[model samples]
Target: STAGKVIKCKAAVLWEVKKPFSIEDVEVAPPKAYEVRIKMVAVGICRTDDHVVSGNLVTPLPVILGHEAAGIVESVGEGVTTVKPGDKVIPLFTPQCGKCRVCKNPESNYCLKNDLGNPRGTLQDGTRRFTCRGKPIHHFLGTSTFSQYTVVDENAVAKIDAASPLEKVCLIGCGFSTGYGSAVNVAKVTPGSTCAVFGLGGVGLSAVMGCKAAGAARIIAVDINKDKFAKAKELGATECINPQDYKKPIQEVLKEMTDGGVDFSFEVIGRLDTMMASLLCCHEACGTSVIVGVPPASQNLSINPMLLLTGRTWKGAVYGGFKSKEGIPKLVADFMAKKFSLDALITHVLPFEKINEGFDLLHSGKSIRTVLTF
Candidate 1:
């Protein structure tokens, strides 16, 4: 029998399609070459995970699903020199194999070798380290933080400041970073610029903070939910509007309010209508719109070609333009330096046992972020 090699751990396993995750005992094998085993200290429930759970996005079944996570390195495989045991870390689903062509490019952060889909739920080595009831279970998005412990590629794990609170800093692994960077990086928001952010969820609020940090003269926050407006204002939203309250289209309303439209706009909700609205609300010339949401696979947005002909630029943002390995640690340092606010974004922290409740809260629009502590 294989002895003293694999570690038995508890994980929330997705056994069936569109079903609640089954809490199962899983056996995690030792990390292979260029891999690291981490004990997940905190994991944030993100909308991306919701897409997978709701069958909006398909993955091979019986996979562990989660990507927003932070943890401590327990061990490393051979040739892994970046980090060692007991190091604080956050797993990056979008990995950075520095030697790849994409990583070398200053314009993009997507690594070529690892960017090839991992749908088989295997590591870069084409195999998995997790099993349940003697059957192999698939991994999700490269970083399956749904489990108490996970093994990830060395390049996918970012070592962060240990003094940073793991529970709060964990959000930096995904949503917070994505939102913050959308304004600071992708949009390159300039001082005294006008910005409109649609969808006032965790990401949207962070975008507001980013706009404020970028020194925007006016920040307009749009949402159907009034509950989010207060928090949005606290995070630097100069104006909050509920689209349902107006008879006119939101795009027209924004154009009238800003006297032609905002210099920048962001769509954080994965809705076709809102995405189009975000574009339409941008200034006629030299305005940029950033899409930060993961829209459904089958759906597509149809836009009038005239929209782009007006000199408006629409671009999609992945991981908020942050190169995971390089940008995340620096983001952690920024957080510790009081460069931004992270605590206000978190409305609830639940034990791992209440993980499903976190999802429920997100779906009900009752929470901004739910950090699950293992």
Candidate 2:
């Protein structure tokens, strides 16, 4: 006798960009050529999810949010050979098509077809297939992971070993990769050098982990939350600073830590204050600051021209200079080797029905990451 019944699951969808995710029973269609269907086991919410919901990033609405997910492949369509049914995989927000020129370049994370708008939800030929209550819904970042299942291009998902727990490994999709890669791949920190990370959220924390993994001598973590400071320590950060009470300039403290200033600084807060703070904390000769966070379009970063004259390099990183096909496997290997902490980054797990509750944690600042389980 069967102990369980076949069922459809609940998912969060923004009926409108400004509206909340209305949980609904969404349906999935059979995969077409070069497509695969994934039954997601875990999904992570990010600030970009908030940005899309709040109308900050312009995109087609009524979209299923959540790009970071790990799951099992349920089916594959014609001409798909890289992965198969029952294989474990992770969906990448920035798909790495190896044949693309930018992807072929060893150091670039930029994609050629990415800006044209992903039409995966449409069909293999780029047409719409997802509909709820007879209304069409667009997929977000090619992987509408807020839902229980997503159908995407075979190139969009990476086959991984099933031994890794989906709840923990799922974050490797975006939060973990973006944060860790920013420091390791993009910034390429030098050994025994000093680096400062502004913001102690998931991205900044991963940056700290990357710095430590690279053998940086001093890793200073700055955040408003005293609690996050301790979390940063657990991940190998050597120094922690809270800007809540400090009336004096923060750059002064950072300068003290680096003797003159840090060799590398990262801005994960995405505000003008934090951006300037990141640039200001630089060693005279060749300190570099990277911007990993996405700020509102209306906000502008104002920097003095003289600061550029100090030999400081400024860069905007996308997906932490990662090529997902190559990077995801390596990141998984690092996690398996205990070089990175994937499990620790997960603060809490909730049912897919509790996605809204997870967002509450995001809005409250009480939790770093709230994952959704299938």
Candidate 3:
């Protein structure tokens, strides 16, 4: 009676490419070995989700698309010990299994156990728990928070303090941590250094906060939209620059503003042109640029080899170099301690049925982050 044991619930299912989500009844099968069933509370609509829906990122269709989410554990499978029923947790898109070689490596944060490129979108056992109208629906990033109930691998869930508000902490699941960790972990931003963050979205603004936390003497925020400048400045950006205001390239403008260039630059916008500009806008001899945005799979960027020779470094980071299970809980603790702020980043909150309107707000650049509640 697997079907009878399943939990029938409502979900926003994406049935095809370039299509709106259809809210329908979906049956979530019971958790199997090493899995846990989660009742989603709050999920953030990240730009990455939009990219997947828009076909910029190649993902199998009819998959539930949501990665940044926080929920309560309702059930656990055999051999699952880290989390129990009634625990508040956040689902990690980047799973951390301590046994993997990448996990053992001190310098790397990626876990080889979870393949982000896998298009099948099933659990590790190559099976799915979600079914819509008697058709098997693929999982999305081991999370799929678009649904009210989801079953995830034990390693993919991180336990957080129950006292923390799920509505606000859901942001730490992805964008906030990615941006904050880019500066604090990957870029290793130094105190009293000049830092520039490109793109003033959730990730970029969080990077600005990271720079400020690291004691950066100056933080320059760059973006095409003039509207985000004020918020960026409020979020610790010492100076704001709009690329459209100057006819010359932004890199050159930044170079002129800070003698040679900034010591560290973060490109949070996933564009080849912005990525290149971020790298070029660094100090000639000792500048580091970290790419935090997720670019389209087909798009490519060309950088001059000479730039590397001049002591400039270009690097990319995933999940903010966080070791998921171990780091996420600590981030939650930090957030609870007021080490950083999340209120400013969350511009809108809506019910699950209004999810498409949230995407529209993001598309029009009117919202920083829109959290959906189930």
lDDT of 3: 0.90
**For candidate 1, lDDT tens digit of each residue in 245-321?**
99999999999999899999999988889999999999988789999887877788898888889899899868888
> Candidate 3 residues 28-109, lDDT tens each?
9999979989999999999988888888887777888898999999898989999999999999988888888989988887
Native-structure RMSD, model 2: 3.2
TM-scores of the models, in the order given = 0.96, 0.92, 0.97
How many steric overlaps does candidate 2 have? 3
Say which prediction, candidate 2 or candidate 3, comes out ahead on lDDT: 3
Per-candidate local distance difference test: 0.88, 0.79, 0.90
Kindly list the per-residue Cα lDDT of model 2 for residues 238-309, writing each as its tens digit: 999987768778987788767889988998866778888888987767898888887765778777878878
Candidate 3 stretches greater than 4 Å from native: 1-4
Using lDDT as the yardstick, the better of models 1 and 3 is: 3
Q: What TM-score does model 3 achieve against the real structure? A: 0.97
Model 1 clashing-pair count = 0
